[PDB]
Design a protein around this ligand. Sequence first.
Ligand SMILES: Cc1cc2nc3c(=O)[nH]c(=O)nc-3n(C[C@H](O)[C@H](O)[C@H](O)COP(=O)(O)OP(=O)(O)OC[C@H]3O[C@@H](n4cnc5c(N)ncnc54)[C@H](O)[C@@H]3O)c2cc1C
Ligand SMILES: Cc1cc2nc3c(=O)[nH]c(=O)nc-3n(C[C@H](O)[C@H](O)[C@H](O)COP(=O)(O)OP(=O)(O)OC[C@H]3O[C@@H](n4cnc5c(N)ncnc54)[C@H](O)[C@@H]3O)c2cc1C
Lengths: 483, 485
Amino acid sequence: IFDLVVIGAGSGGLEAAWNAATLYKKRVAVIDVQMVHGPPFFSALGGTCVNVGCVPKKLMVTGAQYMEHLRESAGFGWEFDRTTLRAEWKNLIAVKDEAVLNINKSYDEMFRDTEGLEFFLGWGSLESKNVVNVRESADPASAVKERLETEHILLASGSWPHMPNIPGIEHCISSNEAFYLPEPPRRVLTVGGGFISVEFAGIFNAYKPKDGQVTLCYRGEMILRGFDHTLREELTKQLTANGIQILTKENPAKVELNADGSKSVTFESGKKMDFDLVMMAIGRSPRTKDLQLQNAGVMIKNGGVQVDEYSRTNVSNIYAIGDVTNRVMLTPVAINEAAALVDTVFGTTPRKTDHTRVASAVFSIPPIGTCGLIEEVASKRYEVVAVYLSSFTPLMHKVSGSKYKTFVAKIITNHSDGTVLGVHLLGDNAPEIIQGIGICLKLNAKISDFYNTIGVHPTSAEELCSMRTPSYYYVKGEKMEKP
Amino acid sequence: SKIFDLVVIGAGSGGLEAAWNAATLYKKRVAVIDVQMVHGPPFFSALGGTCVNVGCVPKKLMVTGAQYMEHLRESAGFGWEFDRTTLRAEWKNLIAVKDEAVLNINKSYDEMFRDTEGLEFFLGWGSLESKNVVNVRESADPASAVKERLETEHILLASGSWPHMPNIPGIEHCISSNEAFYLPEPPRRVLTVGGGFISVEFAGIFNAYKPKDGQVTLCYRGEMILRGFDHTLREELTKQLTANGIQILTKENPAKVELNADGSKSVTFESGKKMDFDLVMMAIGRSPRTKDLQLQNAGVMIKNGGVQVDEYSRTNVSNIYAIGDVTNRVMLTPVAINEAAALVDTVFGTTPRKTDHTRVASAVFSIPPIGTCGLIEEVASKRYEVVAVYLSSFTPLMHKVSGSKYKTFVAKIITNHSDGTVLGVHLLGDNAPEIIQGIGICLKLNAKISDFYNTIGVHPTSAEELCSMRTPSYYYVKGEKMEKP
Ligand SMILES: Cc1cc2nc3c(=O)[nH]c(=O)nc-3n(C[C@H](O)[C@H](O)[C@H](O)COP(=O)(O)OP(=O)(O)OC[C@H]3O[C@@H](n4cnc5c(N)ncnc54)[C@H](O)[C@@H]3O)c2cc1C
Ligand SMILES: Cc1cc2nc3c(=O)[nH]c(=O)nc-3n(C[C@H](O)[C@H](O)[C@H](O)COP(=O)(O)OP(=O)(O)OC[C@H]3O[C@@H](n4cnc5c(N)ncnc54)[C@H](O)[C@@H]3O)c2cc1C
């Protein structure tokens, strides 16, 4: 009765569903737990990105950057009674809510108007290789609302926050509830060193009350493992310069709520500190459990569904894309894989996603843009590696007062032939600058291609066309320098 | 034998690049001449050139300042509140911090001269006595006192350009962009004459710093502002500038300017229309500065205003070269720098080098800005038999909530449809100058439209839209616009 059933109406799910029903005119059903965003299940039609991810995150980080603009405007002659300045968290949450709601509604119309595309509200799970059930709860004993027999199944359930099993974890929230907070915490602890932790630390820092403090803690020695160490070091200094406390090598042991409703957090070290809110942004896990993957023999490996490079699992009827495969957890990668799967299945030529050289950003204040390898893995994979590093205070920040805002640009090459293996940026607009650079690496550009291009002046991005001489090299993993 | 290896007239973007490279890479003794040590009246430009003193660097600081009017207004849609009745822009503070920023670069070029052996700076007006002697005199007047007589084996002409004032009655009541950088306080009614980037950028600056019942008017004698840019970006930018309070008078042409008794200027246009302003700024074009050089003493040819050069920047006279704005090729600082470095390699180095002037990316810092690289469709469709135009315009979600819902982002890619090669990319919207730099490297790489849409986007940005354009909106076959049925 159906050709494709997609469990999950998110970035990858909705893309594959549309791409199939429209381009190959095959009939598909998609399942999701909610129509509109918000509690109880948070994610809804549209997926994590639309509901509790990229889109609301970006509105909130933009709102948080206005603390920067409003302070820095003074260096250019804008005066106002700065004592009347107030950040109003619920005006931001209200506009965010409306913006997300309109995208949920939009997706509903898309089903109501595209023939051959049917949405089913509920929880999908595998009854067998060819039958998917839409039950009414995550529990596999709830009333089967619909039973769908299909010629193909795509799993696109995404991921979900991972909460540690520590005493008092019920007094903690994840990023999901952080999108619905009624008012901004006075003392908030954000646990984790990845992009979600770093981004929410910037958001809370801007909308915090008069005597507020944001603390970020990470169990390792520097935030953002997996990123370039110069960028990690420099972003730490700029985040602490903007009033965020960063506690590294610290990890919560227990959380117990005090009389006030505040939380006392005891760290593994014995340190004890009180906060009004504790957000765990420790990690995200593929959500496989409710799919009942054992009922069709779909194999999972490290928490996520095992798929081959064409997103097929081990049961030929079923495929999986997006976060549930645990490859690169980014919306554009899920959308890319979804189009590549519908082409390999219902099209003529098999397409597979290239997962290397994907550009991405961290929307911290200041932001990061990055594409390619970091020198630590580059020197492991190549015999001689050149590192070109440039760091400068942009002139607007000499004038704005924010003299600590160093822009960092770093290019890494295979020095034997000049191929750019990675470009890493910290500074304003770095997410916008890295997109063109992602196209360059996909075209296998060499460093001579960068410095033979004429620069757009005055911009930060022209620095990338002005890096001609390496700062140091890695020869067989050893750092070396020209004398 | 005789003394300098190179004398450079003009210590600006190209002159200082050429001078530096020859003295350090090639160990040549180089003399560089310019008329002032630090920016400002009377000669405006000085050590560093036009970009540093009265060009790129001061105007980007003033446009960043103007942009805060946007930020301060738009902050309210995200919940920021303050007593908006206390808000004022203090022009004098903006000029004071711009002056310090430019002064500090003037001071470091000076230090650079003190620190480099074989690089000498001479303060004065340079001109040719013959093809191997350069005079440094006290003023532009060819008969003023010779302050230095410099014998040389090679001469580089890097004198830049200057505002072109039209000969209309009353022009002496108008200023150019040079004086606009030193105005004591902001004009209440200002007219900027011209439809090019300098007129449009300053319109945005004046609009943000105008007083209480201030009005900025831009007039252009042709049909639409920014002739030479992409037509959608021209239409759209006119819409967005108008939406922010700038009045644009297209197809209006000034006949005369006269000074009213109170000090205001009265402008009568050729259509009989007449208006009063407190300041009238001419920004109708810039011309090569060749007059004072006394080029006829060496026999250097001039063609359509500028010094005639070949692709390697050699004039018709051996051992005399010219780069930058005086050659009237592409009047942009990075182009002048590139030419300078190619020229010193050709002359003192072993391998001849020339600048590629095609596919140069550039920006207009209007509010909102423009980023552009390559061909606009009207010239591409005349050079190529089939051209595909991909067009995408959308309101960034940020502006759907900030209140400025008129701030449409426009991304346009035009290709040679026979092989998919991207011929031009044109962008209007926030951060478009920063986005276009990476695209400039792609055009130099001869990227195809498939290489753009096969790149995974960075989400959420405006730039990822350039990776989402798979289908042409329309086409140009032998110059006529056609569409798929
Ligand atoms: C706070 C945060 C910030 C992020 N920011 C960015 C960013 O800036 N840029 C970026 O590119 N990525 C970002 N991401 C990651 C991005 O959101 C994901 O990579 C992307 O959503 C993955 O798409 P997907 O198709 O894999 O799943 P999703 O969008 O996660 O879709 C999953 C769908 O499955 C549904 N579901 C689950 N199980 C079932 C079931 N059994 N039955 C029915 N429905 C079910 C869910 O309800 C869901 O809506 C962010 C994520 C988070 C949490
Ligand atoms: C308002 C404005 C905005 C601009 N904005 C941008 C921008 O954002 N980006 C961009 O890339 N370009 C911009 N430009 C253009 C850029 O400034 C020029 O293209 C660049 O300066 C040209 O370099 P040059 O070496 O040709 O000459 P210049 O930098 O113009 O140097 C010429 C020097 O010669 C001197 N001189 C002249 N005649 C004599 C003589 N006879 N003797 C001695 N010295 C002499 C001067 O005093 C001067 O300082 C802008 C220009 C203006 C005016």
